[PDB]
Design a protein around this nucleic acid. Structure first.
Lengths: 106, 1116, 77
RNA sequence: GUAGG
C-alpha cells in the first residue's frame, strides 16, 4: 500500500509538471488521470516476481475479468472454445496466458 | 425385534432411555444451517412438544443480518429476502470418482429498492456453489472425504477472577467482559488498592474517568457508590471532573499525538462499544450475561449498555467487599462469586453450522465492502442486482475453509469405529482458541463438570493430551451451544419415568444420585443410605429420600469407543485409555467374526456408522447377487443397491461389502442388508477371537512380545487386503507434449511384455519392484553426447534419439496384482487441470498375511509385536489335543494393573462351551435365572455391559458347571486353569495353566511400511545433506544427542566419517563410492559444505568472517 | 570366526591403551588392504600378511590376529 | 495437522 502511495506521488509530480490553468476545471479531474496511470504502471511492472511485460499484463487482467463475468452470468465453467471466442483469441493462446499468470509458491 | 442377532445379556438394571442417534451432532447442525425441510420439521415438532428450538435458519439469519446497503445519501437499498437450493448436478459417487466438490447452487432473490427512482427491481442471483453434507456427515471435497469437528471455546460474557500476589501480601480481584467478536474490555480492582479499566490494555487508567466520560454525573455516582469506601477513595483521589474533561483525557490517552475532539471521541466510543457491527454480542453472550449479572430480561439481542457496565462495576466491588450474597442490579438477589473458566458452564462448542456461518459471514462482509466501494464509484440507473454483487468473496472463503483449516480434517476410514470417533471428537485447537503452546496444566486435566458431557478416558496420549476429547454417549447439544445430559426424575424417594435434560450450570443446583445404586422391588430406594454428588464435585452421601435426579444409565460418562471394552471397571484408567485409543487403529480382515465376549452396544455403533448398507423400505428381496441386491416394496418401488467392491479407502484398505439377506427373506425398514469393512451380521468386529494361554515360553515372549501358531498364517485368520493407487499425468512442457506409449527407448523387449499397445499395463498382470506400469516418454532433452557414448554407439550402430524415458515404475519394495486402471484424456469430454493432456491411475492390490514384526493388541491396552511364528506342533497343547493359538507373558498383568483381561478370558472360555444351569438354587444361579442367562449352547455370544458386567461369583459358578466337551470331563479346573502338555519336549508341565478365548485385533502399524534402507539416493538442494523420509529414499538422522553419545566413547574417526564422507561433502562422496567398488582404501575427507553455506550467509550480514591460519592465510 | 574372536585383554596389555590399540591396528589394516589392492605394481615398501589368509577376509581381522600373536611392533615418532 | 514411540 505505502509503495503505491509513493508511486501516486510520483504521478502527481508528473501531472503538476504537465498542468496549466488553461483547462477550465479543477485539479482533481486532470491529476487523477496521471495518478491512475502511475499506479497502473507500477502494479503492472513490479507486482509479479517473474515479471510479465505490460501488454501481456493487460491480457491477463482482461482474461481474468471476462472469465469472472462468464462465471457470474452462466454460473458454470465455460468451454475453452467459448472463452476463446469471447476473447476472440485461439485456445492455444488461452492455455498459454492462463499458465503465464501464476504466482511462485514459497 | 430382528434388528440384531441373538446375544445373551448380563445386565442387572433395565435402561429406560435408549441411546440417541449417535451422529446427530453434525447432521442436525448442518440441517439448521441450510434451513431445509428437515430443520423446519424438527422446529415445529419441538414447538408442539414444547421443547425450545431455534425458529431462524442460520443461512437466512446471516443474510438478514447484512442490512440493506446504504450510501452516504442512503437513497438505494438491497434486500436479500429469500434463498433456495436445487438438486446437485453430480452424484456422490460421480463426484468422488471425477474429483468434483459435491455441491449445489445457491440462488437468492435480491430486491433493489431506490427512493430517488421510487422503484423496486427483483432478480434471482446465483451467489456461488455451496458444498453439501452427505447423509453420513462427510464433506466430499475434490473427491476426498473431509470431516469437520466441533470446537470448544470460552463463551462470551462476564467473568471474574481472584488471585493472590506475593508482593502485595493481599488478594487481587479482576474482571473481564469477553465479547463475541468485538474488542475485549477488562476491569481490575485493588491492583494497588484502587480500581482501573483495560481498554484493550492500551494504558493505565481509572474507572472514575470512564464513568465521568459517560453521562452519569459525579453526584449520582457518589449516591450509588457511597456504601463502599474503595470507590469513594478512588473518586476523591480523582482530580479531573466534568464529562468533557474526562472525555478529552481518555481520547488523548487512547490516541495521543492529535488534539482532543468531542465528536471524535463520542463516535469512537460508540463505534468501539455501542455500534451494532463492531461489538455484536452473540445471543449466548447476552443470555449468559443477564443470568450472571442478575439482570431480569434485558434486550434479547444488542451490544452492551451503560446499565450493564454499572452492573458489572457493582458486581466487582461487591465481590471485593467480601459480601457473598447481594441484591442484583435491576434484578433479584444473587450470589457474588469468582467463576472458574474450566467449568463446563462457561465452555461452549461451535458445531459445523456455526463455523460455516461465521466463514460465510466474513465472506459476505468482504462482499459488502466491495459493493459499497463500487456503489461509491458507480452511476445511478446503471445499477442492477445481478451486476453489483461479486461472487468471488463467498466462494473464496468457503473453499479457503474447506481446505487449509485445522478443524477441516481428513476422514479416517480404518473401520467404522474410526469414522464415528472422528465425527464426534471435540477439538480445543483452532483459530481464536486454545492453541498448542497456550496449553496449561489446568485446562488439560479433567474437571468435575465433564460428567455425561465428555468422556474422561479417551484422549490422545501424545503431547496434545487433554486438548481433544470425545463426546459422551448420551450427550446432546444446546441451541446456544452448551451440552446437556438426561436425568431421570426422582420424587419423594421413588423413581418417576420422565427424563429431563440438564446443562452444566443447572446441574449444580440439585443433588443427583447414581444409577449403579440398587433399587428395590418397589419404586423406592432399596437402601436408605445411598451415594450422591452435589455442588463442586463433592461426593458426600445423603441417606433417605432427599435426591431428585439420578443418572439414566450407568454408562453416561463413557464414550462410544471406551464403552466397547468389556469388564471396564476392573481395568485401570491408563490401560482403558490405551485400549480405547487402539480400537480405532484396527484393520478389517478378509473374513470378520463378531466377538464372543463383548458389551452389547457394538450393534448400535455399527448400524449408526455409515459403512453398513441398511434398507430404507420394508419390502421383499427378489434377486441376490454380489454386485447388487434388488428389493421391492409392497407399494411398488423397486430399489437396487450397489455394493462397493475393493474400493481404496482413505488410509489404503479394502472396503469390500458382503451380502447377508437370502432370497425370500422379509425385510423391515432399516434392516442391514450388507456388511461393510470389519462387520458381521451388522455387529462390529475389528478382530478375531483366539485361544490363549498365559505362560513364559523359551524367552520368545520377553518384554511384551507375542508368540502364536502358524495356523493363523495357514487359515488366513489374520490376513488383510491392501490396495495402492498411483497416478501419472501426460503433462505438456515447453519443448513439446509427453506421450504415453508402448514404444519406450533404450529398454529390453522383455520388460515391455505386459504392456498394452497403448502403453498401459494389463489388468491382472502381477508386478514387482522395478516393473513398468505405463510407458511415458519425454518429448526431448537437449543432448550433447559424450565422446565415449559416441564411440560406443558408432561401434554398435545405434541412434541416441532425443526422446527420454520417464515412465512410472512400481516403487521399490512394493508387490501386487493390478485390479483396476482408469484413464482420463484431454480431447475427450473429461476435463483435467490446465496443461495436462492425459492422466492414468493404476491400482495394485495384495493380500498381506500376519508375519513376524506385525503389531498385535487386545482391548485392554495389551500390545506387542509378533516375535516368532512356531509350527503347529510346538504349541503347548491342551489335554484333548487342541493347540493354543497365542501365548502371552503373565509378568505384564499385575505390573500393568489390568486384571480385566484375565476375567474376560475365563468368560471367553465360558462362551465357547455353553453353560447349563437350571434349578441349582444358588445366589448366582438365581441371578442368572432371573436375568435369563441360564441356558446357553456352545458358540453363542454373551453381553456384559460396561458397568453392569458379570461378577466373579458368577464366573466361578459357571466354571464349576461348564457343559462337558468330550468324554464327560471339563478341561478347565474350577480355579480356571488347565493342564498343558509340552509340544517340543513332550512331558506335561508341572502345574495347570490358565487358558481361554480372547479377542485380538491387528493394529495398522505393520512391518511392511516401516522398513527402509539406503545405499545412496537423492540429495538436498540448498545444502546437499540427504533429504529424509521413506517416500524419497531418505537417510536416518544423526542427532546432536547421538553425536554426544559417540563423543563419550572417545571415538573421533567414526564421527568424522559420519559428518563429512557419508553426507555434506559432494566431492568426497563419489570418491568414496569409487574406492569401495574398486577395492581400495577410503580417502581423506576434506571440509564439509554446510560450513561454506554458513560462512557465506554470515558474510552477507556485513561480518568479514575470515578462515585464517597461524601462518597467515589458510589452505582450503 | 567372529568379531570377538581375538580376546581384547591380551591386545590391550601389549598396546597399553584402548585408543593406541585401535589406531595401531587400523594403520596395519590399512597397509594390508592397500597391499591387496596393489594389483601388481609391486612397491617394495609394502609387505604382505604374515599370518596365513583365507580366500575371503577383511584386512582388520588379519591385523588384529597379528597383534594378538605379537609379531608386529609400533614406535611413536 | 494427526497417529505410533
Amino acid at each position: 500500500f505505502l509503495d503505491l502511495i509513493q508511486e501516486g506521488n510520483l504521478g502527481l509530480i508528473r501531472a503538476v509538471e504537465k498542468f496549466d490553468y488553461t483547462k477550465g476545471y479543477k485539479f482533481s479531474t486532470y491529476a487523477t488521470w496521471w495518478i491512475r496511470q502511475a499506479i497502473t504502471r507500477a502494479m503492472a511492472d513490479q507486482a509479479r516476481t517473474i515479471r510479465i511485460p505490460v501488454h501481456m499484463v493487460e491480457v491477463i487482467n482482461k482474461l481474468a475479468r471476462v472469465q469472472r463475468q462468464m462465471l457470474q452470468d452462466l454460473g458454470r465453467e465455460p468451454t475453452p472454445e467459448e472463452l476463446a471466442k469471447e476473447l476472440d483469441m485461439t485456445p492455444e493462446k488461452v492455455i498459454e496466458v492462463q499458465k503465464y499468470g501464476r504466482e511462485p509458491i514459497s | 425385534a430382528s434388528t440384531a442377532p441373538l446375544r445373551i445379556s448380563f445386565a442387572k438394571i433395565k435402561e429406560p432411555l435408549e441411546v440417541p442417534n449417535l451422529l446427530a451432532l453434525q447432521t442436525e447442525s448442518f440441517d439448521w444451517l441450510l434451513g431445509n425441510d428437515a430443520w423446519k420439521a424438527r422446529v415445529e415438532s419441538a414447538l408442539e412438544s414444547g421443547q425450545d428450538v431455534p425458529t431462524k435458519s442460520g443461512l437466512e439469519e446471516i443474510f438478514e443480518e447484512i442490512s440493506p446497503i446504504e450510501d452516504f445519501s442512503g437513497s438505494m437499498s438491497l434486500t436479500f429476502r429469500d434463498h433456495r437450493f436445487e438438486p446437485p448436478k453430480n452424484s456422490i459417487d460421480e463426484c468422488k470418482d471425477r474429483d468434483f466438490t459435491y455441491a449445489a447452487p445457491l440462488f437468492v432473490t435480491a430486491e433493489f429498492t431506490n427512493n430517488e427512482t421510487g422503484e423496486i427491481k427483483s432478480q434471482t442471483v446465483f451467489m456461488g456453489d455451496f458444498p453439501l453434507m452427505t447423509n453420513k456427515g462427510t464433506f466430499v471435497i475434490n473427491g476426498t472425504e473431509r470431516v469437520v469437528v466441533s470446537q470448544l471455546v470460552r463463551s462470551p460474557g462476564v467473568y471474574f477472577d481472584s488471585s493472590i500476589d506475593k508482593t502485595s501480601d493481599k488478594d487481587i480481584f479482576s474482571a473481564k467482559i469477553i465479547p463475541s467478536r468485538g474488542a475485549w474490555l477488562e476491569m481490575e480492582i485493588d491492583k494497588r488498592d484502587m480500581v482501573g479499566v483495560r481498554i484493550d490494555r492500551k494504558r493505565k487508567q481509572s474507572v472514575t474517568v470512564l464513568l465521568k466520560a459517560l453521562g452519569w454525573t459525579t453526584e449520582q455516582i457518589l449516591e450509588e457508590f457511597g456504601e463502599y469506601e474503595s470507590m469513594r477513595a478512588t473518586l476523591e483521589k480523582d482530580h479531573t471532573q466534568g464529562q468533557d474533561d474526562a472525555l478529552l483525557d481518555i481520547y488523548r490517552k487512547l490516541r495521543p499525538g492529535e488534539p482532543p475532539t468531542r465528536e471524535a471521541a463520542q463516535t469512537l466510543l460508540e463505534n468501539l462499544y455501542f455500534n451494532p457491527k463492531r461489538y455484536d454480542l452473540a445471543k449466548v453472550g447476552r443470555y449468559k450475561v443477564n443470568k450472571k449479572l442478575g439482570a431480569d430480561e434485558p434486550l434479547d439481542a444488542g451490544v452492551l449498555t451503560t446499565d450493564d457496565v454499572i452492573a458489572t462495576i457493582k458486581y466487582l466491588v461487591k465481590l471485593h467487599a467480601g459480601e457473598t450474597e447481594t441484591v442484583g442490579e435491576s434484578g433479584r438477589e444473587i450470589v457474588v462469586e469468582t467463576d472458574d473458566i474450566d467449568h463446563f458452564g462457561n465452555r461452549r462448542i461451535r458445531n459445523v453450522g456455526e463455523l460455516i456461518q461465521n466463514q460465510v459471514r466474513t465472506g459476505l462482509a468482504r462482499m459488502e465492502r466491495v459493493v459499497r466501494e463500487r456503489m461509491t464509484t458507480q452511476d445511478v440507473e446503471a445499477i442492477t442486482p445481478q451486476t453489483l454483487i461479486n461472487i468471488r468473496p463467498v466462494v473464496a472463503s468457503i473453499k479457503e475453509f474447506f481446505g487449509t483449516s485445522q478443524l477441516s480434517q481428513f476422514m479416517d476410514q480404518n473401520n467404522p469405529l474410526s469414522g464415528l470417533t472422528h465425527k464426534r471428537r471435540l477439538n480445543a485447537l483452532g483459530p481464536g482458541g486454545l492453541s498448542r503452546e497456550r496449553a496449561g496444566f489446568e485446562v488439560r486435566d479433567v474437571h468435575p463438570s465433564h460428567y455425561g458431557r465428555m468422556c474422561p478416558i479417551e484422549t490422545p496420549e501424545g503431547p496434545n493430551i487433554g486438548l481433544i476429547g470425545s463426546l459422551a454417549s448420551y450427550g446432546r447439544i444446546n441451541p446456544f451451544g452448551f451440552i446437556e445430559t438426561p436425568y431421570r426424575k426422582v420424587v419423594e424417594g421413588q423413581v418417576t419415568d420422565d427424563v429431563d435434560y440438564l446443562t452444566a450450570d443447572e446441574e449444580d443446583r440439585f443433588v443427583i444420585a447414581q444409577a449403579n445404586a440398587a433399587l428395590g422391588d418397589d419404586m423406592r430406594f432399596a437402601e436408605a443410605r445411598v451415594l450422591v454428588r452435589r455442588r463442586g464435585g463433592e461426593v458426600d452421601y445423603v441417606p433417605g429420600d432427599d435426591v431428585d435426579y439420578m443418572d439414566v444409565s450407568p454408562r453416561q460418562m463413557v464414550s462410544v469407543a471406551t464403552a466397547m471394552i468389556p469388564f471396564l471397571e476392573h481395568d485401570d484408567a491408563n490401560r482403558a485409555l490405551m485400549g480405547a485409543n487402539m480400537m480405532r487403529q484396527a484393520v478389517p480382515l478378509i473374513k470378520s467374526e463378531s466377538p464372543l465376549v463383548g458389551t452389547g452396544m457394538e450393534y448400535r455403533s455399527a448400524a449408526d456408522a455409515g459403512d453398513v448398507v441398511k434398507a430404507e423400505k420394508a419390502g421383499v428381496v427378489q434377486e441376490v447377487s454380489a454386485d447388487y441386491i434388488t428389493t421391492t416394496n409392497d407399494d411398488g418401488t423397486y430399489i437396487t443397491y450397489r455394493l462397493a467392491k475393493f474400493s481404496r479407502s482413505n488410509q489404503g484398505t479394502s472396503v469390500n461389502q458382503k451380502v447377508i439377506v437370502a432370497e425370500g427373506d422379509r425385510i423391515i425398514e432399516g434392516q442391514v442388508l450388507a456388511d461393510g469393512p470389519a462387520t458381521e451380521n451388522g455387529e462390529m468386529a475389528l478382530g478375531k477371537n483366539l485361544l490363549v494361554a498365559f505362560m513364559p515360553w523359551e524367552g520368545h515372549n520377553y518384554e511384551d512380545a507375542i508368540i502364536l501358531s502358524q495356523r493363523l498364517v495357514q487359515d488366513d485368520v489374520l490376513s488383510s487386503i491392501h490396495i495402492e493407487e498411483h497416478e501419472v499425468d501426460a503433462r505438456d512442457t515447453k519443448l513439446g507434449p509427453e506421450e504415453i506409449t508402448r514404444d519406450i527407448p533404450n529398454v529390453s523387449e522383455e520388460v515391455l511384455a505386459d504392456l498394452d499397445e497403448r502403453g498401459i499395463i494389463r489388468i491382472g498382470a502381477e508386478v514387482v519392484a522395478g516393473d513398468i506400469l505405463v510407458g511415458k516418454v519425454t518429448p526431448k532433452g537437449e543432448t550433447e553426447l559424450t565422446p565415449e557414448e559416441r564411440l560406443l554407439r558408432a561401434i554398435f550402430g545405434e541412434k541416441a534419439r532425443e526422446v527420454r524415458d520417464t515412465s512410472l515404475k512400481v516403487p521399490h519394495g512394493e508387490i501386487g496384482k493390478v485390479i483396476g486402471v482408469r484413464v482420463f484424456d484431454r480431447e475427450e469430454g473429461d476435463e483435467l487441470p490446465p496443461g495436462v493432456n492425459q492422466l492414468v491411475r493404476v491400482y495394485v492390490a495384495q493380500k498381506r498375511k500376519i508375519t513376524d514384526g506385525d503389531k498385535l493388541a487386545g482391548r485392554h491396552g495389551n500390545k506387542g509385536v509378533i516375535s516368532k511364528i512356531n509350527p503347529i506342533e510346538d504349541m503347548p497343547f491342551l489335554e484333548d489335543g487342541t493347540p493354543v493359538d497365542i501365548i502371552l507373558n503373565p509378568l505384564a498383568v499385575p505390573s500393568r494393573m489390568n486384571p480385566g483381561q484375565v476375567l474376560e478370558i475365563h468368560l471367553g472360555w465360558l462362551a465357547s462351551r455353553g453353560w447349563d444351569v437350571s434349578g441349582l438354587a444358588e445366589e448366582w444361579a438365581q441371578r442368572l435365572q432371573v436375568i435369563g442367562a441360564d441356558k446357553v449352547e456352545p458358540g453363542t455370544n454373551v453381553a456384559t455391559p460396561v458397568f453392569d458386567g458379570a461378577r466373579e461369583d458368577e464366573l466361578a459358578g459357571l466354571l464349576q458347571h461348564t457343559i462337558p466337551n468330550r468324554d464327560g470331563e471339563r478341561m478347565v479346573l474350577p480355579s480356571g486353569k488347565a493342564r498343558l502338555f509340552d509340544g517340543r519336549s513332550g512331558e506335561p508341565f508341572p502345574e495347570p495353566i490358565s487358558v481361554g478365548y480372547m479377542y485380538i485385533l491387528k493394529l495398522h502399524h505393520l512391518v511392511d511400511d516401516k522398513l527402509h534402507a539406503r545405499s545412496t539416493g537423492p540429495y538436498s538442494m540448498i545444502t546437499q545433506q540427504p533429504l529424509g523420509g521413506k517416500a524419497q529414499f531418505g537417510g536416518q538422522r544423526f542427532g546432536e544427542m547421538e553425536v554426544w553419545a559417540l563423543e563419550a566413547y572417545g571415538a573421533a574417526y567414526a564421527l568424522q566419517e559420519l559428518l563429512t564422507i557419508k553426507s555434506d561433502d559432494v566431492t568426497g562422496r563419489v570418491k568414496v563410492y569409487e574406492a569401495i567398488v574398486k577395492g581400495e582404501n577410503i580417502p581423506e575427507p576434506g571440509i564439509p559444505e554446510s560450513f561454506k553455506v554458513l560462512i557465506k550467509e554470515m558474510q552477507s550480514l556485513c561480518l568479514n568472517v575470515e578462515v585464517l591460519s597461524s601462518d597467515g592465510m589458510s589452505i582450503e | 570366526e567372529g568379531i570377538i574372536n581375538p580376546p581384547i585383554d591380551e591386545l590391550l596389555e601389549a598396546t597399553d591403551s584402548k585408543y593406541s590399540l585401535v589406531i595401531y591396528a587400523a594403520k596395519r589394516a590399512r597397509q594390508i588392504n592397500a597391499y591387496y589392492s596393489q594389483l601388481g605394481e609391486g612397491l617394495l615398501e609394502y609387505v604382505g600378511p604374515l599370518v596365513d589368509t583365507h580366500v575371503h577376509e577383511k584386512p582388520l581381522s588379519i591385523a588384529l590376529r597379528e597383534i594378538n600373536a605379537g609379531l608386529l611392533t609400533s614406535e611413536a615418532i
